[PDB]
Design a binder for these strands. Structure first.
Lengths: 135, 65, 53, 106, 70, 76, 76, 73, 82, 75, 69
RNA sequence: AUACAUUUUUUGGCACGGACGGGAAGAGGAGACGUCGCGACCCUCGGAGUCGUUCUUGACUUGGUCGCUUGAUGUUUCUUCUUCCCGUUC
């Protein structure tokens, strides 16, 4: 069940509680959404890598709950319950992002995980639903 | 003929069409304005072959013999 | 191999995949260049012909 | 090898130079002019333009058939009526937005 | 007794000046209509009471008009 | 997006909308008008540095203020 | 006749929100509306300042937010 | 719909709702006021009922903005 | 008499359009209303010193459109016939 | 009820000190006596006087001020 | 076509919010289908009254917010 | 299957190695006036609901203050260089 153009065209489309598309092993063929969504819900799928996106200027929210994200190739990124294991794997997020959630990922239990994210991704204001504070 | 316009555009052009609203089809079109972010002084004008025009824009049309 | 190959992204409609070349645009720019309107599309093409010699 | 080497020759005026837009009596004065400060200046400022002009020349020559084809098109469309011009445009459009292979090919 | 339209009619072939939505004008009135669009001869462009240029034969669009005066 | 003739034929499509003040209303066109007034199903006003955002809801939008409309996505 | 007008009329009673050309949002119970969106409203806040019975002329109105219950039925 | 209470009422309303949406999106496709009466509470509505039950069991007492949330049907 | 009619007659033309706010709009006129509401396809919005933004379909309103820049080749007299 | 047209008519009958405000123009006002009446708000007003508003007095002749740019009347 | 139902506001003092960020006050005496207002005079908003009665054009009115309930 | 332009919409009151960007330091961007936010010694403390009539509807009610210890944003007047780091392009 490839993420295909045909798949995207029959997918529930609605205004959420922003314009959101309701959605797989590999993220691909996003061209067909035509950059018309503010949010894309990819929860409960089997994606391994957050990669493969076309240029999408609209896209501001990515809900990627319960997948198998182990590597990273936009204002809000929800990655709860995935497979990121090393602090260094979170490095690509420095190039984006204000709301970040990485809970229920092995990486969470690494020593200094919170401080590492804060220094390497300073643009984040809320991390794991807690305010990044000055101290 | 020359036309003055709401947006500071002196339209020197050849008239083709005319109506109640003073909309105009224009040939041999030569507009005159000034792209200028202050203090600056530039005088610019461009040729256009064929051009439709809307009437609310028109302030005063004039004819130079 | 080339499933996402599309000619319409290379040729405009007025070119008809190499049948014609769209020179109207350049006739416009040309009018802008000569600072008048005495020049018609056909007289412009007549000008271009010079470059065949 | 040719163009910038006095490729344009006249039995009367001699040798023309694309960069200085002047002729020259003999090849001798032509050569000793290609080192002069004038020609250095010009060939150093108007090089890209001269070269582009030349390309326009040779590429337009290679496309003579397309040039003619289009000029023809222009005259045709020009001599159309309203309905005619409209239907023709329709045709160009259809050709543009049509599958490269029809479900009804041999 | 004097309405506006009749006054306007009367004032044909006579000097008038027009302000806009701003620059003053000055010229002899040629003719007028119900919509209050104008056609003038010997038009002089009073840029806030400064005759910048003398255009001559002109046609003023109604909606930009502010007032008429002698 | 499809290649429509008119606005009426593309009813209930998610629409970007520009207005004279510079705001951008986005939402599904429920109903049109003789004077281009628009009913929008789930309307979000987006204003501009960087995009400020406000969710409105069901909105009647006056055509005077409307500049131009663009298609954001397909139905549903 | 305009369906947006109809919608507005229906919204009578309900708490509509309402911005003008000026950009001064109101919220209130919609008392009365006309073909020209000549709205009256009760118990109305004005972006803030509270006020009683505001009248607004549709010419100067920009956009009107109606409650999302009217989406359901039965005008369309 | 699940009813949540014991929420940090210092979060602005629009931020609370957006974090609530984010947090609860993990269980399925998804009302909060700051009045005296309703402050510190929210109703989260899901398309699927199984999603509501899963959310309830898995996020009972989840630390949110500093406090352990209490969830109920 | 009517320029509306003329406008209507102009169909499928790839044209630039100029607004009261100065926005230059390159697109194919698929249709126009009786009240000059332009309906374009294959559209390209550019401002008068900044970057471009392209779009598939745009319905622009009649009150906004200051000047529709017509095509290169056009027989005007013919168009003007009833 | 007293309609606007009726009021205008009354004013005309009277010939009284009328002070007109300009639409979308704060700084300027007009002061004269109503002479004309139209179907629209347009009127002719002889012996008019342009006024710069207090955030003096200026010379002005007989004028018709166009109906679209009127705001206030008083007479 | 339809008359603006301002019979509720008849013979009451109203804040006529008018074009260009200005204001007017005064008791409502009449109106028409174009929403022109005829009112017994009051001040322009510190404050200064002009006129005995006043007539405001339809186009000029932003709002006519009731001072009295 | 065989129709028009003079106040509420559209004839408008509109307009005036090389680049790039961000952040910090050092030398020769700054002042109002507003409008919505990070923290807190503070304040403050908790579509729904009722009834008449009939097997389903009609009426009536309902963050504010202080800092920023270098938060974000329009109007409006006046007058950049060098160094280091991080990202795009060739």
């Amino acid at each position: 069940m490839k993420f295909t153009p045909s798949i995207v065209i029959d997918a529930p489309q609605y205004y959420v509680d922003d314009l959101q598309l309701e959605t797989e092993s590999m993220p691909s063929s996003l061209k067909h959404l035509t950059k018309p969504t503010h949010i894309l819900d990819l929860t409960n799928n089997d994606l391994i890598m957050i990669p493969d996106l076309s240029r999408r200027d609209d896209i501001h929210t990515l809900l990627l709950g319960r997948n198998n994200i182990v590597e990273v190739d936009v204002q809000n990124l929800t990655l709860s319950n995935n497979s990121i294991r090393r602090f260094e794997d979170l490095q690509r997020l420095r190039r984006a992002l204000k709301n970040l959630t990485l809970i229920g990922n092995q990486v969470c239990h690494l020593a200094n995980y919170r401080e590492h994210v804060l220094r390497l991704v300073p643009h984040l204001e809320t991390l794991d639903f807690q305010n990044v504070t000055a101290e | 003929v020359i036309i003055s316009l709401r947006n500071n555009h002196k339209i020197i052009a050849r008239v083709k069409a005319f109506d109640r609203h003073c909309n105009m089809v224009l040939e041999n079109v030569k507009e005159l304005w000034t792209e200028k972010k202050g203090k600056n002084v530039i005088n610019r004008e461009r040729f256009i072959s064929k051009l439709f025009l809307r009437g609310d824009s028109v302030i005063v049309v004039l004819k130079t013999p | 191999r080339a499933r996402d190959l599309d000619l319409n992204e290379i040729f405009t409609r007025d070119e008809q995949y190499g049948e014609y070349m769209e020179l109207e645009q350049f006739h416009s720019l040309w009018l802008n260049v000569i600072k008048r309107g005495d020049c018609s599309l056909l007289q412009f093409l007549d000008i271009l012909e010079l470059f065949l010699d | 090898h040719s163009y910038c080497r006095g490729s344009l020759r006249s039995e009367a005026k001699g040798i023309y130079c694309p960069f200085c837009s002047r002729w020259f009596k003999t090849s001798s004065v032509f050569e000793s002019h290609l080192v002069g400060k004038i020609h250095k200046k010009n060939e150093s400022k108007r090089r890209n333009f001269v070269y582009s002009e030349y390309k326009l020349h040779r590429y337009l020559k290679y496309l003579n058939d397309e040039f003619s084809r289009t000029r023809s098109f222009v005259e045709r469309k020009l001599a159309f009526t309203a309905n005619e011009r409209m239907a023709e445009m329709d045709i160009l459009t259809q050709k543009y937005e049509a599958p490269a292979y029809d479900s009804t090919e041999k | 007794p004097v309405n506006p339209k009749p006054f306007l009619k009367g004032l044909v072939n006579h000097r008038v000046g027009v302000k806009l939505k701003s620059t003053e004008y000055r010229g002899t009135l040629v003719s007028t209509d119900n919509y209050f669009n104008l056609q003038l001869n010997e038009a002089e462009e009073f840029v806030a009471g400064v005759s910048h240029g003398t255009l001559g034969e002109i046609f003023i669009r109604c909606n930009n008009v502010l007032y008429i005066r002698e | 997006v499809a290649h429509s003739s008119r606005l009426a034929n593309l009813i209930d499509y998610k629409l970007r909308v520009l207005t004279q003040d510079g705001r951008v209303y986005i939402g599904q066109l429920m109903a049109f008008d003789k004077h281009m007034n628009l009913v929008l199903n789930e309307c979000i006003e987006e204003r501009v540095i960087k995009v400020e955002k406000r969710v409105l809801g069901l909105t009647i939008l006056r055509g005077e203020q409307i500049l131009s409309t663009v298609v954001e996505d397909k139905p549903l | 006749n305009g369906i947006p007008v109809k919608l507005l009329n229906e919204a009578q009673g309900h708490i509509v929100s309402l911005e003008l050309t000026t950009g001064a949002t109101y919220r209130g119970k919609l008392v009365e509306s006309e073909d020209s969106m000549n709205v009256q409203l009760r118990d109305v806040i004005a972006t803030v300042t509270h006020m009683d019975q505001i009248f607004v002329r549709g010419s100067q109105i920009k956009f009107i937010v109606v409650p999302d219950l009217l989406k359901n039925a039965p005008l369309f | 719909t699940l009813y949540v209470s014991q929420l940090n009422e210092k979060i602005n309303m629009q931020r609370l709702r957006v974090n609530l949406f984010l947090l609860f999106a993990t269980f399925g496709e998804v009302v909060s006021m700051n009045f005296k009466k309703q402050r510190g509470q929210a109703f989260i509505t899901m398309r699927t009922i199984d999603q509501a039950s899963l959310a309830q069991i898995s996020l009972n007492g989840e630390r949110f903005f500093g406090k352990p949330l209490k969830v109920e049907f | 008499m009517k320029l509306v009619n003329f406008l209507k007659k102009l169909r499928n033309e790839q044209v630039t359009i100029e607004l009261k706010n100065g926005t230059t709009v390159w697109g194919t006129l698929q249709s126009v209303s009786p009240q000059m509401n332009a309906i374009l396809t294959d559209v390209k919005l550019t401002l008068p010193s900044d970057n471009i933004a392209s779009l598939q379909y745009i319905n622009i309103r009649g009150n906004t459109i200051r000047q529709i820049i017509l095509p290169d080749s056009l027989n005007l007299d013919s168009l003007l016939v009833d | 009820m007293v309609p606007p047209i009726n009021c205008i008519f009354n004013f005309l009958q009277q010939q009284t000190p009328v002070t007109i405000w300009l639409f979308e123009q704060i700084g300027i006002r007009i002061k004269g006596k109503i002479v004309g009446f139209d179907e629209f708000m347009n009127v002719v007003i002889d012996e008019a006087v342009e006024i710069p508003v207090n955030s003096k007095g200026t010379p002005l002749g007989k004028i018709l001020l166009k109906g679209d740019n009127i705001t206030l009347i008083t007479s | 076509v339809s008359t603006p139902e301002l019979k509720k506001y008849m013979d009451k003092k109203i804040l006529l919010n008018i074009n260009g960020s200005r204001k007017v006050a005064g008791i409502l005496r009449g109106y028409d289908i174009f929403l022109n207002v005829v009112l017994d005079d009051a001040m322009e908003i510190n404050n200064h009254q002009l006129g005995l009665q006043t007539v405001i054009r339809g186009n000029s009115i932003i709002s006519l917010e009731a001072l009295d309930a």
